[PDB]
Structure 1
Amino acid sequence: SALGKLQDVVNHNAQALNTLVKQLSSKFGAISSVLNDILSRLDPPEAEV
Structure 2
Amino acid sequence: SALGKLQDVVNQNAQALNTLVKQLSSNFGAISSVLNDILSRLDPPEAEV
Looking at structure 1, the residues matched to 36 and 3 of structure 2 have their Cα atoms a distance apart, in angstroms, of 46
Question: Percent identity, aligned pairs only?
Answer: 96
Where does structure 1 differ by over 4 angstroms across 4 or more consecutive aligned residues?
none
RMSD, aligned α-carbons:
0.9
Mark the runs of 5 or more structure 1 residues left unpaired by the alignment.
none
Answer 1 or 2: which has greater helix percent.
2
Q: TM-score, normalised by structure 1?
A: 0.86
Matched residues, number: 49
Cα drift, residue 43 of structure 1: 2.1
Cα drift, residue 9 of structure 1: 0.6
